[PDB]
Amino acid sequence: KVFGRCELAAAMKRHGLDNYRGYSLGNWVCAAKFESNFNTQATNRNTDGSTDYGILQINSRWWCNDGRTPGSRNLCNIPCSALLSSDITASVNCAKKIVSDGNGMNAWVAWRNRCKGTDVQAWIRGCRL
Ligand SMILES: [Cl-]
Ligand SMILES: [Cl-]
Ligand SMILES: [Cl-]
Numbered sequence: 001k002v003f004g005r006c007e008l009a010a011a012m013k014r015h016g017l018d019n020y021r022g023y024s025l026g027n028w029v030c031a032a033k034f035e036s037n038f039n040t041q042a043t044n045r046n047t048d049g050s051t052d053y054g055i056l057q058i059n060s061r062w063w064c065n066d067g068r069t070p071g072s073r074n075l076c077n078i079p080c081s082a083l084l085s086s087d088i089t090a091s092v093n094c095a096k097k098i099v100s101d102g103n104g105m106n107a108w109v110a111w112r113n114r115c116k117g118t119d120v121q122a123w124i125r126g127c128r129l
Contacts, residue, residue, distance in 0.1 A: 002040070008088075010129065012029065012088070012125070024121075025129070030111065048103055058094050062075050063076045065079050
């Protein structure tokens with residue numbers, strides 16, 4: 001599924017991401033924009049052989065099992081395919097664990113390089129929240 005911008009904002013808010021760990025909703029929407037282009041089915045292979053999955057490009061190196069990342073962990077205790085569902089619950093639940101791990105949203109390289117320090121409000125502007 002390719003979410004609309006306000007559509008994703010609404011789902012992220014209902015799942016309690018708005019201000020989770022102090023990060024306002026626009027930060028999460030901006031991160032999804034540049035991690036996945038709002039596409040739940042996005043996958044991208046990392047240099048180390050791990051793969052990033054889903055709307056928030058969650059990495060098999062630490063957070064999910066894909067059976068092809070030898071030596072990795074599965075800290076969210078889910079198959080990485082669950083992070084590709086049309087329903088974002090799995091991805092949100094796992095993102096909450098990631099952003100609590102100590103480094104905040106810096107875990108998302110696209111957020112650090114393209115959202116952090118910008119007017120992230122713009123990503124929710126005009127949405128009925
Ligand atoms: Cl915001
Ligand atoms: Cl594996
Ligand atoms: Cl933080």
